[PDB]
């Protein structure tokens, strides 16, 4: 599994969460940003790792990342569909 | 004791005088007018385009041609014969020593670059600095371009002194220093 | 100008002494023919600034 | 309605698309503003100037080709010695280009004539103008005037078209029209309108040239008024192909006419036939492939298709007069055709991807799978099977094994339907030859042709595997499942999921452009080692034959050394040693430039944008230092354009060393 | 819309006020609607002042040169080669010195009227013999500079083309056998298909 984490300067798009493909993204209320909401990561267990999230993010720099773990990967995290690892 | 064999073939000057620094006291190079590689190339380049030229009718324009690129072949013998060329490959050399006063030397090519390409460069950054936009980098204010291009003559003058007087450089804090490297 | 050079007006020039068929030949090959057509060039210049200033309404 | 013909879009570069409407803020624009030029379909507008753009454009293409024929036939009448070749052939190099002597470039003018010094030309525009009846400077003229009119009227007709066709044109859309009309009066009522050209003004002509009169009493002969000659003067029986011409060392131009008239009742007769024929099987096909792109890719196979005939039928069939002696010619256009066949299916396999991408697919993507993976399973078959029978021959030649190696003296691989393939052709058992030259001999077909062959198809059906792996997949796939919505051409999904570089049919279509020109590199080879070996050379009184690579075929092309060593460096000689040499100077040069780029393109294709992107930030550093601030920000090449750039440069560079090294060869060598 | 009394089917052209030739007002391409036009008066003045030393000097060296120990070649254009290296540095140093020094620095098409716009053309250099005639007749003496300055880089253009086409002096105009010009013996793409230097 990768490690998807959402930083403070996030100011509530919904774009990374628009663009997830596989729902690890959410949007939970706050109160750092006009918006009154910022994204949040609470299935990274299923984060293929497309970084769609990262292209869409408006920050100066990201205020979502996505960092990739190769040696951690699951089969929910390789898209796995011809071979079941459960 | 023959420093030719010592080294394996080259050969040392053995001698300390202000005389031997020009490049027309080396005894690797020969004025080209008395060397016997210049010519014997130049003597074969005459002998292979006479002998294409013979292939010919005597009358066509192709025989006037090779007439034309004889005498070419000829005025560029006699005209490199003040020109070095080494002992043993009988090449015109090109001199890099600064001397400014040889034949085929490298300081005139590299002044009337330097110049030239500073103009080029001065141009550009005059009309980058006069047209402060994107939409003007596009579609071309030609006659402020042809005005700075024309203007920029004046390069080696106008550089200096914005150099001297802060109006080339920029504060290493005014422009994107690079990548963060450290912060935790 | 036909009429003239075949009825046997010419310049007082041996290079001249020519056919009106082989007259534009001759003539390329002799020289003015380029001149006229820089001539003619500079005063076409002129024309297709006239056209263009009138076909725009300028003048 | 032309009111709207107006040049204020000229100025505002990018307009075509929407996308490009937010100005050049980077350099990333330019290269998108040059992408979508021709991709009407994206661009702004009802679908109306879809068709508009895509019309004209056709024609203003056919008034560029028009134009290209006119300076050809412009280069035939003043700039060319057609004059003594007509006279003698076989004693002069066809010439239409000179070099104007400028920085010692007289060098590459060679002798082609005593009164003529310019470029060998090998487009054999000279044997088709012979074939074509041409023997005086003003039918090239004309022929060049009526280019130029053609030029004028279709670069017309392409503009007039942009606002003639209007939203409620259709008539692009009657294919049934389309196609009658097409067949019928254009392969059926043409063909015989040339086979009454030829028959009218070849047959009068060639016999006479043939007949020893090139002379032709100027015009009292040559010019037509000849009707005491007979059409078929001159067919001595026998089959077409079965005698050859004996004089031009060609088939009969009586033939030829004969063929052209009989192929243009065929079309007419199928023409007549399509009111009432078999349908109702292709007619999913006829409802799901009215589009532009499908039409498209349909049309591209199918030129392609017909292009490698032509490159196989153009060398031993010959059709040209004195044209199969003249061997870079032959050579030319053999290869030639060969690079645009794989260039077109390349083609045909990028627009069937972008018909699936915008159209609806049809039954057979359902069931991709097998299909894309028995391809797979083939090519890996015949990959392991015929290149390491190569492989096997030089390991064991290598070892001091030769009796153990796959050749004819060894253990022989024969081309079994081949050696009973003397269905074509099925000539004498003997050669025919015209001036110390060979015209045709049959190719004895052994083991080495076994195994090229083996190696060709093997390389044909990976190429087909990426096409049809790249078409089938295009919509979606079992690693990404909204492919679709990604686009035609997008550089990957992501890092994620293992790595998503790559999947876009784009890309497969970047990799089987690498593949056909390795698959096609091989039939080059293969075409230029067997000619040489096997057919091409000179010849003996004593009926014996002297090839020019003296049979090295058969002995040599069963190792890969073999095709280093008497191909790549032993036939190679000509262009290395091709300095100060008049004629092949150029083709040295151009050999060295072609492994410049090759190699440059690698700098594209093995590398990131990534890497470039930060050290162009570093550069932009020290511009910024000196208020030297390029608006239009400098951004890298983006991912697809870094690989769209490597495989251009990369296949340019390769064809243009193989260019070099097969051109002055054979211009050497005759 | 009124028309250039020069050129009457042009219109006429405005930034084109009096100067000198504003009873003929001449521009027909335009480059006083597209450049600073006391630039283009500045360059016209400068060129029409160098072209009138210059047709003098043409004339004067094949007859009155021979500066005491200087070469004399006849065929003026040929003067440059046969002069002393000397003389013409220090001729090139003076001109660029009075260059320099005449506009303070500010010797650029983007500078050179900036904060200093003074006159187009006007250098304060012998301005004691003028404007004693009330404004009225010193435009007159400035039309007469600026027509003899045109008419002087007219006549130098054709001095040096005839020099050219005559391969000679300047003087013995027509000389002896000449029987007129064919001398540019530069090939061109028509003369290469008008002399059949190509085809054949
Ligand atoms: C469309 C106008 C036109 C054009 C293109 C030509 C073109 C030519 N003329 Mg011509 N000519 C013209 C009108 C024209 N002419 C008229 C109206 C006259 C009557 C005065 C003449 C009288 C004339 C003579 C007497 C000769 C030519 C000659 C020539 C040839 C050499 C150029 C030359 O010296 O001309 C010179 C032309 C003039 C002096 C007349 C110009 C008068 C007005 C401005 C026109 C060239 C093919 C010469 C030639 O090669 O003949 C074989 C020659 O000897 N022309
Ligand atoms: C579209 C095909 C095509 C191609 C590839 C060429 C290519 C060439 N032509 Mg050419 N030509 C063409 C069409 C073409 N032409 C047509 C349609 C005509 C009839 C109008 C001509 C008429 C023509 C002439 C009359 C001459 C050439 C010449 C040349 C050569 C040098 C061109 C030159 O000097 O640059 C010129 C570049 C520019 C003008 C920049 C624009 C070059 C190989 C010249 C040549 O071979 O000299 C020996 C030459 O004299 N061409
Ligand atoms: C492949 C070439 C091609 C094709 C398929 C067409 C097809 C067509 N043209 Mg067209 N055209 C072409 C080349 C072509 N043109 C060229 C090269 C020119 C320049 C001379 C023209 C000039 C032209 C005009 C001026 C007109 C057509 C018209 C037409 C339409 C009816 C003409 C007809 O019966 O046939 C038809 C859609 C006519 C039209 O739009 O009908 C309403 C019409 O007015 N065309
Ligand atoms: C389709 C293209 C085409 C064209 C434009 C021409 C054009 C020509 N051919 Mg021709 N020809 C062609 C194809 C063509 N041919 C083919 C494919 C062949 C087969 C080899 C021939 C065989 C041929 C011969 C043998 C002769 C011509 C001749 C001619 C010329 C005058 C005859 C004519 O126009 O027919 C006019 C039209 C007809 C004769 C057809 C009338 C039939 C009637 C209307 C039907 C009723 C018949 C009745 C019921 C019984 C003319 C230049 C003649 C020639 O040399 O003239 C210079 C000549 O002797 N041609
Ligand atoms: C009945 C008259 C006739 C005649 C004289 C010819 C004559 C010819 N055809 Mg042909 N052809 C004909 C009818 C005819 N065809 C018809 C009716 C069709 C439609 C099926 C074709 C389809 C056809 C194709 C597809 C090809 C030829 C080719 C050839 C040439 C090679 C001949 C050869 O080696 O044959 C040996 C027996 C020759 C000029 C070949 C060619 O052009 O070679 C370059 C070729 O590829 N023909
Ligand atoms: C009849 C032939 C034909 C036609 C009409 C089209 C039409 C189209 N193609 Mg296409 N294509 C063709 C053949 C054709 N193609 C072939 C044979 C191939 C295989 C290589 C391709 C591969 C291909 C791809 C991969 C793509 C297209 C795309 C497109 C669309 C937009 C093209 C565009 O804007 O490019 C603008 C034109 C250019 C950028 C031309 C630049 C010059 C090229 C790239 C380099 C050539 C180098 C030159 C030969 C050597 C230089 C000489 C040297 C000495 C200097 C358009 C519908 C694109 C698309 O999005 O489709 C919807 C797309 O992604 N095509
Ligand atoms: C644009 C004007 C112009 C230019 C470029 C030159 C340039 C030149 N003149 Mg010159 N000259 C001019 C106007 C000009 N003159 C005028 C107006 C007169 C008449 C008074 C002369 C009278 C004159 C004489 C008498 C001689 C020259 C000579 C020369 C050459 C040597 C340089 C020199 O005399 O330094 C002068 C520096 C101060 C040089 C090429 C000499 C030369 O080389 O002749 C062979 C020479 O003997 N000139
Ligand atoms: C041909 C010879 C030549 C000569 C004699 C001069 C002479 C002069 N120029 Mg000058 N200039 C020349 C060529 C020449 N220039 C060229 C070719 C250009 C174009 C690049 C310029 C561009 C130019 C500008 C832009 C400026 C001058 C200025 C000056 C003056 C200041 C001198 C000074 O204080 O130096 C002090 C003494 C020194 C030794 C410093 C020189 C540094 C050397 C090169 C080391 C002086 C009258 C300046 C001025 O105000 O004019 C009044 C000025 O702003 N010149
Ligand atoms: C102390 C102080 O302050 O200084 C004062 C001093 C002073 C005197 C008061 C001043 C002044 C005025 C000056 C210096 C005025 C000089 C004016 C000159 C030299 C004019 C030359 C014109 C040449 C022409 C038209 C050539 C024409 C040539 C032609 C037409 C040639 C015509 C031919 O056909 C002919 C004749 C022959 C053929 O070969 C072809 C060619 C040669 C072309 C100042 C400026 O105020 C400053
Ligand atoms: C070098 C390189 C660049 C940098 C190269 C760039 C930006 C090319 C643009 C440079 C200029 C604009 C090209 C213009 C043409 C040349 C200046 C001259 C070519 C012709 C000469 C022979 C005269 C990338 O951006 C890139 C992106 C993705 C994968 C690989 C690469 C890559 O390899
Ligand atoms: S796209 Fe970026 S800024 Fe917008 S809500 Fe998501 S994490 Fe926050
Ligand atoms: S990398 Fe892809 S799957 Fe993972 S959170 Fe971002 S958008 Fe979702
Ligand atoms: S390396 Fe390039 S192509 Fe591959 S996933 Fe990363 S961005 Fe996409």
Known sequence: ?86 | ?184 | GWIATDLGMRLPGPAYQVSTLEAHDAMVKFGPMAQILIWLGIIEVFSFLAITNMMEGTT | ?670 | ?200
């Open chain 1, 1 to 86: 599994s990768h490690a998807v984490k959402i930083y403070d300067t996030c100011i509530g798009c919904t774009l990374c969460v628009r663009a997830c493909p596989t729902d690890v993204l959410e949007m939970v209320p706050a109160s750092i940003n006009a918006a009154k909401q910022v994204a949040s990561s609470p299935r990274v267990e299923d984060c293929v790792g497309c970084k769609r999230c990262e292209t869409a993010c408006p920050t100066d720099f990201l205020s979502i990342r996505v960092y990739l773990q190769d040696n951690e990967e699951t089969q929910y995290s390789l898209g796995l569909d011809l071979v079941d690892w459960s």
């Open chain 4, 1 to 670: 309605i032309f009111r709207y013909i107006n040049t204020t879009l000229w100025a505002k570069a990018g307009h075509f698309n929407k996308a490009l409407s937010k100005g050049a803020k980077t350099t990333t624009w330019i290269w998108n503003l040059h992408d979508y030029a021709h991709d009407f379909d994206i661009q702004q507008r009802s679908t109306g100037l879809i068709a508009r753009k895509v019309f004209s454009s056709n024609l203003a293409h056919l008034s560029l080709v028009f134009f290209w024929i006119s300076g050809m036939h412009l280069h035939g009448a003043y700039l060319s010695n057609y004059d003594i070749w007509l006279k003698d052939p076989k004693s002069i190099t066809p010439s239409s280009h000179l070099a104007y002597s400028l920085i010692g470039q007289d060098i590459l003018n060679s002798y082609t004539s005593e009164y003529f010094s310019g470029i060998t030309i090998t487009s054999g525009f000279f044997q088709l103008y012979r074939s074509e009846g041409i023997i005086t400077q003003s039918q090239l003229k004309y022929a060049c005037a009526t280019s130029l009119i053609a030029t004028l009227i279709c670069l017309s007709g392409s503009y007039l078209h942009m606002q003639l066709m209007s939203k409620f044109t259709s008539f692009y859309k009657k294919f049934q029209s389309l196609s009658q009309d097409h067949l019928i009066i254009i392969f059926g009522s043409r063909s015989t309108s040339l086979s009454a050209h030829q028959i009218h003004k070849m047959l009068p002509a060639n016999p006479l040239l043939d007949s020893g009169i090139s002379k032709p009493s100027i015009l009292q002969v040559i010019s037509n008024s000849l009707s005491y000659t007979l059409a078929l003067f001159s067919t001595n029986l026998s089959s077409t192909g079965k005698l050859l011409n004996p004089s031009t060392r060609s088939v009969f131009l009586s033939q030829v006419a004969a063929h052209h008239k009989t192929t243009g009742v065929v079309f007419i007769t199928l023409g007549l036939i399509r009111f009432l024929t078999m349908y109702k099987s292709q007619f999913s096909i006829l409802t799901s492939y009215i589009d532009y792109h499908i039409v498209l890719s349909i049309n591209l196979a199918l030129i392609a298709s017909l292009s490698i005939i032509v490159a196989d039928h153009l060398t031993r069939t010959p059709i040209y007069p004195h044209k199969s002696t003249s061997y870079p010619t032959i050579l030319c256009l053999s290869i030639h055709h060969a690079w645009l066949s794989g260039f077109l299916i390349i083609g045909s396999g990028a627009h069937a991807s972008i018909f699936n991408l915008l159209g609806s697919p049809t039954s057979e993507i359902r069931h991709r799978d097998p299909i894309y993976s028995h391809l797979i399973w083939v090519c890996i078959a015949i990959g392991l099977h015929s290149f390491s029978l190569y492989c096997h021959n030089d390991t064991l030649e290598a070892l001091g094994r030769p009796e153990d190696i796959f050749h004819d003296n060894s253990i022989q691989l024969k081309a079994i339907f081949a050696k009973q393939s003397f269905l074509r052709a099925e000539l004498q058992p003997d050669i025919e030859m015209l001036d110390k030259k060979i015209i045709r001999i049959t190719q004895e077909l052994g083991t080495a042709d076994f195994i090229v062959h083996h190696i060709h198809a093997f390389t044909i059906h990976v190429t087909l595997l990426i096409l049809s792996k790249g078409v089938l997949y295009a919509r979606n796939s079992r690693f990404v499942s909204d492919k679709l919505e990604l686009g035609f051409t997008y550089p990957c999904d992501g890092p994620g999921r293992g790595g998503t570089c790559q999947i876009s049919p784009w890309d497969h279509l970047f990799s089987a452009v690498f593949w056909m020109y390795n698959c096609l590199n091989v039939v080059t080879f293969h075409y230029f080692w067997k000619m040489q070996s096997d057919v091409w050379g000179f010849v003996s009184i004593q009926k014996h034959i002297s090839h020019y690579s003296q049979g090295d075929f058969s002995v040599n092309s069963i190792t890969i050394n073999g095709w280093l060593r008497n191909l790549l460096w032993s036939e190679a000689s000509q262009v290395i040693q091709s300095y100060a040499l008049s004629s092949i100077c150029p083709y040295g040069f151009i050999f060295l430039i072609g492994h410049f780029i090759w190699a440059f393109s690698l700098m594209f294709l093995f590398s990131g944008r990534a890497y470039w992107q930060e050290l162009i930030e570093s550069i932009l550093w020290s511009h910024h230092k000196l208020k030297i601030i390029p608006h239009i920000q400098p951004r890298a090449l983006s991912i697809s354009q870094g690989r769209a750039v490597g495989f251009i440069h990369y296949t340019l560079g390769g064809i243009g060393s193989t260019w070099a090294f097969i051109i002055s060869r054979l211009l050497v060598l005759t």
């Open chain 5, 1 to 200: 819309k009124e028309t250039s009394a020069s050129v009457p089917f042009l219109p006429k052209p405005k930034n084109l006020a009096g100067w000198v030739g504003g009873e003929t007002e001449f521009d027909p391409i335009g480059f006083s609607n597209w450049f600073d036009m006391k630039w283009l008066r500045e360059a016209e003045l400068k060129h029409g002042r160098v072209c009138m030393m210059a047709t003098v000097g043409f004339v004067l060296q094949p007859y009155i040169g021979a500066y005491p120990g200087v070469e004399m070649p006849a065929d003026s254009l040929q003067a440059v080669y046969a002069a002393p290296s000397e003389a013409w540095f220090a001729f090139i140093f003076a001109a660029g010195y009075i260059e320099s020094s005449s506009y303070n620095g500010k010797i650029t098409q983007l500078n050179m009227f900036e904060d200093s716009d003074r006159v187009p053309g006007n250098l304060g250099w012998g301005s004691t013999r003028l404007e004693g005639m009330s404004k009225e007749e010193s435009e007159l003496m400035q039309l007469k500079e600026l027509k003899n300055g045109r008419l002087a880089m007219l006549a130098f253009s054709g001095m040096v083309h005839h020099n050219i086409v005559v391969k000679g002096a300047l003087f013995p105009l027509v000389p002896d056998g000449w029987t007129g010009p064919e001398p540019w013996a530069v090939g061109s793409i028509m003369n290469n298909x008008x002399x059949x230097x190509x085809x054949x």
């Open chain 2, 1 to 184: 004791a023959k420093p030719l064999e010592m080294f394996g073939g080259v050969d040392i000057d053995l001698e300390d005088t202000p005389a031997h620094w020009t490049i027309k006291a080396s005894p690797v190079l020969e004025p080209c007018k008395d060397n016997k590689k210049f010519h014997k190339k130049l003597k074969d380049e005459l002998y292979k385009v006479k002998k294409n030229q013979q292939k010919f009718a005597e009358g066509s324009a192709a025989y006037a041609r090779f007439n034309k690129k004889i005498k070419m072949i000829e005025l560029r013998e006699t005209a490199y014969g003040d020109r070095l060329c080494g002992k043993k490959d009988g090449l015109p050399r090109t001199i890099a020593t600064g001397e400014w006063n040889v034949r085929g030397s490298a300081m005139w090519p590299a002044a009337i670059f330097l110049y030239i390409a500073g103009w080029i460069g001065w141009a550009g950054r005059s009309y980058l600095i006069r047209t402060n936009d994107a939409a003007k980098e596009i579609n071309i204010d030609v006659p402020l371009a042809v005005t700075c291009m024309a203007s920029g003559f004046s390069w080696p003058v106008a550089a200096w002194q914005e150099i001297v007087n802060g109006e080339m450089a920029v504060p290493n804090d005014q422009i994107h220093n690079g990548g963060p490297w450290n912060q935790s």
